[PDB]
Design a protein around this motif. Structure first.
Motif, short mmCIF file in Angstrom:
data_model
loop_
_atom_site.label_atom_id
_atom_site.label_comp_id
_atom_site.label_asym_id
_atom_site.label_seq_id
_atom_site.Cartn_x
_atom_site.Cartn_y
_atom_site.Cartn_z
N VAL A 57 0.89 -1.17 0.11
CA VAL A 57 0.20 0.03 0.00
C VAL A 57 0.82 1.37 -0.15
O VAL A 57 0.55 2.27 -0.74
CB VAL A 57 -0.92 0.08 1.26
CG1 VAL A 57 -1.95 1.12 1.10
CG2 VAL A 57 -1.85 -1.32 1.21
N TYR A 58 1.96 1.25 1.03
CA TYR A 58 2.59 2.47 0.95
C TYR A 58 3.51 2.52 -0.28
O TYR A 58 3.80 3.91 -0.74
CB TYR A 58 3.63 2.16 2.19
CG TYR A 58 3.06 2.68 3.37
CD1 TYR A 58 3.03 4.45 3.59
CD2 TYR A 58 2.60 1.67 4.49
CE1 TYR A 58 2.36 4.59 4.86
CE2 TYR A 58 2.26 2.54 5.74
CZ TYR A 58 1.95 3.69 5.78
OH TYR A 58 1.29 4.31 6.98
N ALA A 59 4.13 1.52 -0.95
CA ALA A 59 4.86 1.74 -2.42
C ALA A 59 3.77 2.28 -3.30
O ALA A 59 4.36 3.20 -4.11
CB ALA A 59 5.26 0.37 -2.55
N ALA A 103 4.19 5.78 -5.46
CA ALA A 103 4.11 5.75 -6.77
C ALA A 103 3.23 6.70 -7.10
O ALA A 103 3.20 7.38 -8.47
CB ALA A 103 3.76 4.33 -7.44
N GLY A 104 2.27 7.00 -6.51
CA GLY A 104 0.95 8.06 -6.73
C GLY A 104 -0.31 7.37 -7.58
O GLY A 104 -1.16 8.23 -7.65
N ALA A 109 -3.89 1.40 -7.87
CA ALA A 109 -3.31 0.50 -7.52
C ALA A 109 -3.30 0.66 -5.87
O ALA A 109 -3.25 -0.45 -5.26
CB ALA A 109 -1.84 0.26 -7.90
N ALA A 110 -2.97 1.87 -5.57
CA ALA A 110 -2.86 2.01 -4.11
C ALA A 110 -4.43 1.69 -3.28
O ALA A 110 -4.45 1.02 -2.30
CB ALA A 110 -2.68 3.46 -3.72
N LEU A 116 -3.45 11.81 -1.91
CA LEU A 116 -2.94 11.34 -3.04
C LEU A 116 -3.70 12.37 -4.29
O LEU A 116 -2.64 12.03 -5.26
CB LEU A 116 -2.92 9.88 -3.25
CG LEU A 116 -1.89 9.08 -4.20
CD1 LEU A 116 -0.70 9.36 -3.26
CD2 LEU A 116 -2.43 7.83 -4.11
N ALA A 117 -4.71 12.52 -4.30
CA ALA A 117 -5.17 13.48 -5.28
C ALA A 117 -4.24 14.50 -5.75
O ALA A 117 -4.24 15.15 -6.75
CB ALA A 117 -6.48 13.68 -5.19
#
Ligand code: GDP
Ligand code: MG
Ligand code: MG
Ligand code: MG
Ligand code: MG
Ligand code: MG
Ligand code: MG
Ligand code: MG
Ligand code: MG
Ligand code: MG
Ligand code: MG
Ligand code: MG
Ligand code: MG
Ligand code: MG
Ligand code: MG
Ligand code: MG
Ligand code: MG
Ligand code: MG
Ligand code: MG
Ligand code: MG
Ligand code: MG
Ligand code: MG
Ligand code: MG
Ligand code: MG
Ligand code: MG
Ligand code: MG
Ligand code: MG
Ligand code: MG
Ligand code: MG
Lengths: 703, 62, 82, 85, 205
Positions: D33-35, D39-40, D44-45, D84-85
């Motif tokens: 999740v953190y990776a 990645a942004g 996938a997150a 993240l947005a």
RNA sequence: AAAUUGAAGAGUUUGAUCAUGGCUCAGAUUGAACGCUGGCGGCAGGCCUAACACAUGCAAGUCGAACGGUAACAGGAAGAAGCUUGCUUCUUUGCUGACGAGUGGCGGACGGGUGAGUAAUGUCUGGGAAACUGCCUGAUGGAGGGGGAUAACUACUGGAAACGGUAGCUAAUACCGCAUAACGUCGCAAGACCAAAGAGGGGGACCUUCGGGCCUCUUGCCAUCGGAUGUGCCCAGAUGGGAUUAGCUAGUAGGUGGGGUAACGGCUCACCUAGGCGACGAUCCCUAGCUGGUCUGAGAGGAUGACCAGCCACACUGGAACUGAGACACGGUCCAGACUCCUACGGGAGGCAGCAGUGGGGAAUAUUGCACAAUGGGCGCAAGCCUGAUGCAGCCAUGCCGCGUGUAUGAAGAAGGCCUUCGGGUUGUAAAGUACUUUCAGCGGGGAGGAAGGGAGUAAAGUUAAUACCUUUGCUCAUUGACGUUACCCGCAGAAGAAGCACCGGCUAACUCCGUGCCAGCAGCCGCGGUAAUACGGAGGGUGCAAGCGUUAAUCGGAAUUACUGGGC
């Protein structure tokens, strides 16, 4: 509950001369009974019986070590009998250990070197076993040694010890070619296997190399057994060969009632003969139940105070034969339970001191190893922890049980030394150590002689005493140095009589009191009075006041009591106050004591009397071959002889010797008599002796 | 430390062990302790009959 | 397990218990939440043998406190039903 | 050991193995999740968050972590995804 | 815990009569009461404050047959209890079972009373009590036990208990051999020669 | 109602006086030791020093009502031992009671010990918010279904032991996903997501493959919210000495964000700010567990923290984490260090500051004890097992308390001692003698209380459908105490078995003689002894206390002599 039946118990000792093979035989017994996984050897210190550090280092057994083994047989013939073996020390310097054990044991395996055979300490342990009236078998060990002669050793047992030994296992082959043993009942030759450590063996058919000797000795064994009971005699004379079972039973009866000693042979260090000896033990030696019941006393005796069967039904009775040091609980008492049952934590009575003792823990022994056991039955040897005032030979029992048993005699120590610690910040610690050691060992005493500040250590030998000293250094560590005991002399006048005086100028015009005395001293004769001081009143010229005319002798007591010459006392002096002067108002006794002291001093000065050393009478029993040597030693010593006697079994010499001299006389006597002579002392009346130390001790302090 | 030996007659050698209690002599300037008689092989005073508990002397039969 | 139990104070061969609501981990004589009455097994005279604080004991039982066997028996005896 | 606490030693060993396995499984999913967050890619997150949510919830219920720990993970990662947005 | 010794020495050291003997004969006939026991009893050294205080305290102690530990405990109890410390101390000393036994009869001396108490020959308020210091409370019935009455010492002591002042706080039944302890004795009911304040100040010293 | 009613001074500087100022003494207290002496009982206390090192035996187990099962015992059944077709017991069957080992649950973090560390990471007082909490308890629900293991065990096999290795499986209230779960977690919302375990008793029906299903009852299981208990965290004040220790700190002080915690927080990290603490004593050094309390004191105070109770810290030394609700765990793990022990030499095991006990140290402090019968604790539905907690026993006059060792009479005021003025005085009614009593100790006989409970039967209702099973309450029946030959009571005897220690110059109560002669010695302070010593030693006599007494050590008082109460220059 009982793990083994009463009948299948064999309480035995292994007794012999020094290095006869006792510890090696014990090690092979343990190996062949399986409790020991390695045979080991004594000279490398791997013996389990020799568990103490001194024993490991010096190769000798100094303590009686009790252990237990289970034996079925060479062919697993019997259900496992439990043999309670005790390995005893053959040193003459540890005789109390062997006597201690031998009191409680039921049988003895007497080991004899095939070369030397009967030796001095073999004879010593023979006498101890004889006085305890115990059955014996014999084990001729050291059959692998050049010069070994089994038949000759048997004849030595016959001639020297006074026995009538019965051969039971003859030897096949020469000394170094010691193949095995032919049994004189089975007619089988056991040959032990050399590839492994003698654990296995083979029965062979007595080859032709010896069939005449074996046949002759087997016939002798048969007739020896036949000479046991008329039921055997009649059939033997009728001419049918006795069956082996009846032969063994009759020979067992002979063993119990001590008509014979069954002698076998072997070589423990070469791993041969030990299993045969073990079967001999099982078959021929008694069990705790195969003897008439033990006896004691109860309330000044009775028709039969005690008859205690070897059974659990009866109230508990035992005998605590060994006392041993423990750094962590302070004591460990090895006792044999003669009749009854006891459990851990139970209370009992010591019939001797008449006090209650609680068995804190009961354990079974295997050398130094202790294993806890819940209970002990009759005929079983165990060790108790929690006893704190019980001594050797003490009877521990339930209420209403026998009080005094045969164990009330110990030998007398012979060597005496004076022990002093290197650091004099060690007096109390060393004294405590020596006191506890004396408590464990009855034949070893420690006492502070009160004429000096020294502390005298008396033991059975020089080996005993230096073993005690270095064990004191190791366990409960305190260093120590040995020396010589000091000497307590006495004086006597050499027939001098005078009217000596005593006068001190106490008046001085104003002091108000003074006195004067005029006394006479005489020697009576050398030792005609239990009271060394004597007095005959003759105060006539100026009779002192009447309140202590007869009491001017208790005051003169103290001058004789100690130190007219070199701080030592006197005997045979008799004082006689004949004249004096005073005033008949206040005759102060304290002021008259100065006059008495000055009179005594002037009297000694005019007497010039001399000193009597302490000479005691020594009575020595020695064989009639070393008589010249021992009396020559006593004559090289400045000692006199008294009386010629010739015993049937030796000669008794009596002599008079000083005390400053004959320091360590026991070791010299043993050296010059092969350790086969004894001596006792009784401190006879003194005699004159020219010694340069008498004036040395007093002139060390100037005037 | 320096300590007095009270009573008449003692046996204290150069290495005897003894018991030391408090006190002082007050005319020996420097002795501030007393030797307890009859304790730690310092024998009690001989032929003493009064103040007998001090000086470590036992009760005679009398 | 907040037990109500007997604390065993008193003297040698003369016990006397305090009825205490105490957390079960603590020692018998140790920490307790409160003391609700007492008990004297050797009181054999006109004097009172036991006393219990019934309403407080009921409050703690409602809160969930456990009752020991002796406390239960003594409560039964205190109540006149037994 | 003297008493039979060796049984609890064995049990603690086995529980250590099991708990270590499950805890490392949890932590690698959280690492995924953190990776994805780094990645942004919010898709996938978010997928990794949805896959780890049952994992952490189930392990908290079983008792390997605590409900507070699981909620902390979920809240922090949801906040990260939202930013993240 | 009891003075086992001569009693007239104590009496003449304290000067006055402590009532440590029966009335069979006179104290002056039994001893030289005027002087002190010692070989230096003729001399009369000057006394001090401490001397008179100690002598008064010892007089009370020897009157009641009590030792210093128990007497200090009595003083502590008296000082604790409200009122005059000396009066409280004297009331506590009169509460002793041997004391009330003697004051009622049953014994010609307080040591005799102590034997009667200790020998389980005295019953207090129905209960048999054999403690000499057992403190008797108001309205208590102190009675002799069975199998002890009519014997020589008891009857002689009851008869000899006449010819002396009757306590005004007991109301003894001499015939039936029990008495009552209705209330504690007051100051006026005792010797009145003994200075209790001397003892109080000695123990506050 | 009462909760207090409480305060004493003396010796000593001087020729003498008064002040000042020290020293000493009279009181109380001890975890005391030493000397002499010593009867009993009750209740308390009992390594203050080497947290120095520890042999040996115990101090933590329980559950078969979770499971596979069968090592030992017992019961039944199936038989060609015994055998007079069995009463005299050879073997098999977990089948039933039970149960070693094994998996599994709970406990083991409680209880017990010590004060080494810790001077503020602690304790006491009073509050607070960001918390979790096994067991206990209240409310509401759920408790389809499925899977692969693996221990034990079997086979082989290593190892001296400790303990393992290679395969084969067999169970579960062991583990795992799915189904379902919301007043639960995440999210503002939408919505997304998370659990389970079953077992025992009895049972008229009815269906069975004599396994049971099925209906009940009692337990356990899982989710949430509570309560109580317990724990964690934060803040203010108080809690030793030293300045012959004035500067200390760099994750250090704060902020932002990430991570971590059960929880807030430099707790941790990456940066930004350059702060924060300190003369109201930081930092540094020494010491020390803290408290309610204990001793003392009239108080204020001073000193102290033995027993008992609360909290903290530690567990051979240092570090770390695992499991678990709770630990960084006395009797657990791992590592490193020293020590100790076994070893078959290849390896292996341990931590008494748990109860006893040993050595050492010290002036000095105990048994290698009996029961779990009381009360608690753990486990279990219970029975019951364990419990060096706890209740008792032993040793020690260590302390407090009680009692005893005789009571009355008894003048030859005996003898003997001591003194004497030689008359006598005194020991002294003391003894002897006479009568009387027998506490206590010693023997013999009765005898409570600490015992509530538990087990079996039955009655009642409750339950259910079932007057069955299971609770709850009566009624009885035989019962459970280590202490214990108990406390307590009755009888035998004969004053028998039971008195010593210190002091006697003044302070300070009690004086003469003798022997020594500034010697021997005494002494708490002043001081005594060099020729008539009440001051030394012995005797006689007296004084104080008394199974104790005295000596030494320690605290306070007196000492208003650290003076806040309450002093001076
Ligand atoms: N050659 C040989 N040596 C032996 C024999 N028995 C014992 N030894 C050795 O002799 C010495 C003494 O024997 P040991 O068993 O110690 O006997 P103990 O001293 O009498 O008990 C040791 O070195 C033994 O190994 C034997 O039969 N033959
Ligand atoms: Mg040998
Ligand atoms: Mg040799
Ligand atoms: Mg965060
Ligand atoms: Mg007393
Ligand atoms: Mg240690
Ligand atoms: Mg036990
Ligand atoms: Mg089992
Ligand atoms: Mg399976
Ligand atoms: Mg589960
Ligand atoms: Mg500072
Ligand atoms: Mg410290
Ligand atoms: Mg004051
Ligand atoms: Mg302590
Ligand atoms: Mg953890
Ligand atoms: Mg632990
Ligand atoms: Mg331990
Ligand atoms: Mg010592
Ligand atoms: Mg219980
Ligand atoms: Mg006379
Ligand atoms: Mg009696
Ligand atoms: Mg009953
Ligand atoms: Mg009873
Ligand atoms: Mg005076
Ligand atoms: Mg004196
Ligand atoms: Mg003094
Ligand atoms: Mg004179
Ligand atoms: Mg003050
Ligand atoms: Mg001033």
């Amino acid at each position: 509950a009982r793990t083994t039946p009463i009948a299948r118990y064999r309480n035995i000792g292994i007794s012999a001369h020094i290095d006869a093979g006792k510890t090696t035989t014990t090690e092979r017994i343990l190996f062949y009974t399986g409790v020991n996984h390695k045979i080991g050897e004594v000279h490398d210190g791997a013996a389990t019986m020799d568990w103490m550090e001194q024993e490991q280092e010096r190769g000798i057994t100094i303590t009686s070590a009790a252990t237990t083994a289970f034996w079925s047989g060479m062919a697993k013939q019997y259900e496992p009998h439990r043999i309670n073996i005790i390995d005893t020390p053959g040193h003459v310097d540890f005789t109390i250990e062997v006597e201690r054990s031998m009191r409680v044991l039921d049988g003895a395996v007497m080991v004899y070197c095939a070369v030397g055979g009967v030796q001095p300490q073999s004879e010593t342990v023979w006498r101890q076993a004889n006085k305890y009236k115990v059955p014996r078998i014999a084990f001729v060990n050291k059959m692998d040694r050049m010069g070994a002669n089994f038949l000759k050793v048997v004849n030595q047992i016959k001639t020297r010890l006074g026995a009538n030994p019965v051969p039971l296992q003859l030897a096949i082959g020469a000394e170094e070619h010691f193949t095995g043993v032919v049994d004189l009942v089975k007619m089988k030759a056991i040959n032990w296997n050399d590839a492994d450590q003698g654990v296995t063996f083979e029965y062979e058919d007595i080859p032709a190399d010896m069939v005449e000797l074996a046949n002759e000795w087997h016939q002798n064994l048969i007739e020896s057994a036949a000479e046991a009971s008329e039921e055997l005699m009649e059939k033997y004379l009728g001419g049918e060969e006795l069956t082996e079972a009846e032969i063994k039973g009759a020979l067992r009866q002979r063993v119990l009632n001590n008509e014979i000693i069954l002698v076998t042979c072997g070589s423990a260090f070469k791993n041969k003969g030990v299993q045969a000896m073990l079967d001999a033990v099982i078959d021929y030696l008694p069990s705790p139940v195969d003897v008439p019941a033990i006896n004691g006393i109860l309330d000044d005796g009775k028709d039969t105070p005690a008859e205690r069967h070897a059974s659990d039904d009866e109230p508990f009775s035992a005998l605590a034969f060994k006392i041993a040091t423990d750094p962590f609980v302070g004591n460990l008492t090895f006792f044999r339970v003669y009749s009854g049952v006891v459990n851990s934590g139970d209370t009992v009575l010591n019939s001797v001191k008449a006090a209650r003792e609680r068995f804190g823990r009961i354990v079974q022994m295997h050398a130094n190893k202790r294993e806890e056991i819940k209970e002990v039955r009759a005929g079983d040897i165990a060790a108790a922890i929690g006893l704190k005032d019980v001594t050797t030979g003490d009877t521990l029992c339930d209420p209403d049980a026998p009080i005094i048993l045969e164990r009330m005699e110990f030998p007398e120590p012979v060597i005496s030394i004076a022990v002093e610690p290197k650091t004099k910040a060690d007096q109390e610690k060393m004294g405590l150590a020596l006191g506890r050691l004396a408590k464990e060992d009855p034949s070893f005493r420690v006492w502070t002689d009160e004429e000096s500040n020294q502390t005298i250590i008396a033991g059975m030998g020089e080996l005993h005493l230096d073993i005690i000293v270095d064990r004191m250094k190791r366990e409960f560590n305190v260093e120590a140095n040995v020396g010589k005991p000091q000497v307590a002399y006495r004086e006597t006048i050499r027939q001098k009589v005078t009217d000596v005086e005593g006068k001190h100028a106490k008046q001085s015009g104003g002091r108000g009191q003074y006195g004067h005395v005029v006394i006479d001293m005489y020697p009576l004769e050398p030792g005609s009075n239990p009271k060394g001081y004597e007095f005959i009143n003759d105060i006539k010229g100026g009779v002192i006041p009447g309140e202590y005319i007869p009491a001017v002798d208790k005051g003169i007591q103290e001058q004789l009591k100690a130190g007219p010459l070199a701080g030592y006392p006197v005997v045979d002096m008799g004082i006689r106050l004949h004249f004096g002067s005073y005033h008949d108002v206040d005759s102060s006794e304290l002021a008259f004591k100065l006059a008495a002291s000055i009179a005594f001093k002037e009297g000694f000065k005019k007497a010039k009397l001399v000193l009597l050393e302490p000479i005691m009478k020594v009575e020595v029993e020695t064989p009639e071959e070393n008589t010249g040597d021992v009396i020559g030693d006593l004559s090289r010593r400045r000692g006199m002889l008294k009386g010629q006697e010739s015993e049937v079994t030796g000669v008794k010499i009596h002599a008079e010797v000083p005390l400053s001299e004959m320091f360590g006389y026991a070791t010299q006597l043993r050296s010059l008599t092969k350790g086969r002579a004894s001596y006792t002392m009784e401190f006879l009346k003194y005699d004159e002796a020219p010694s340069n130390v008498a004036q040395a001790v007093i002139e060390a302090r100037g005037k | 430390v320096t300590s007095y030996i009270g009573g008449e007659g003692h046996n204290l050698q150069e290495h005897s062990v003894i018991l030391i209690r408090g006190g002082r002599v007050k005319d020996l300037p420097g002795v501030r302790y007393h030797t307890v008689r009859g304790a730690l092989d310092c024998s009690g005073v001989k032929d003493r009959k009064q103040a007998r508990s001090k000086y470590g002397v036992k009760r005679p039969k009398a | 397990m907040v037990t109500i139990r007997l604390a065993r104070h008193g003297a040698k061969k003369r016990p006397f218990y305090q009825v205490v609501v105490a957390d079960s981990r603590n020692a018998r004589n140790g920490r307790f939440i409160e003391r609700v009455g007492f008990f004297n097994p050797i009181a054999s005279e006109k004097e009172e043998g036991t006393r219990l604080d019934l309403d407080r004991i009921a409050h703690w039982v409602g809160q969930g406190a456990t009752i020991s066997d002796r406390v239960a028996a003594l409560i039964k005896e205190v109540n006149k039903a037994a | 050991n003297i008493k039979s606490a060796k049984k609890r030693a064995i049990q603690s060993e086995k529980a250590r193995k099991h708990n270590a396995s499950r805890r490392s499984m949890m932590r690698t999913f959280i690492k995924k999740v953190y990776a994805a967050i780094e990645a942004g890619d919010k898709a996938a997150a978010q997928k990794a968050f949805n896959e780890m949510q049952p994992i952490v919830d189930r392990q908290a219920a079983k008792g390997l972590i605590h409900k507070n720990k699981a909620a902390r993970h979920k809240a922090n990662l949801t906040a990260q995804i939202n930013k993240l947005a | 815990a009891r003075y086992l010794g001569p009693k007239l020495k104590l009496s003449r050291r304290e000067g006055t009569d402590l009532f440590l003997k029966s009335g069979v004969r006179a104290i002056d006939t039994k001893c030289k009461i005027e002087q002190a026991p010692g070989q230096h009893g003729a001399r009369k050294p000057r006394l001090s404050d401490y001397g008179v205080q100690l002598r008064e305290k010892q007089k009370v102690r020897r009157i009641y047959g009590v030792l210093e530990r128990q007497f200090r405990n009595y003083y502590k109890e008296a000082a604790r209890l409200k009122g005059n410390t000396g009066e409280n101390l004297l009331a506590l000393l009169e509460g002793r079972l041997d004391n009330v036994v003697y004051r009622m009869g049953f014994g010609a001396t307080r040591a005799e009373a102590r034997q009667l108490v200790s020998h389980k020959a005295i019953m207090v308020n129905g209960r048999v009590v054999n403690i000499a210091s057992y403190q008797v409370s108001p309205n208590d019935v102190v009675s002799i036990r069975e199998k002890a009455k009519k014997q020589s010492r008891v009857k002689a002591a009851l008869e000899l208990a006449e010819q002396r002042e009757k306590p005004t706080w007991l109301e003894v039944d001499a015939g039936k051999m029990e008495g009552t302890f209705k209330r504690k004795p007051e100051r006026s009911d005792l010797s009145a020669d003994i200075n209790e304040h001397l003892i109080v100040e000695l123990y506050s010293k």
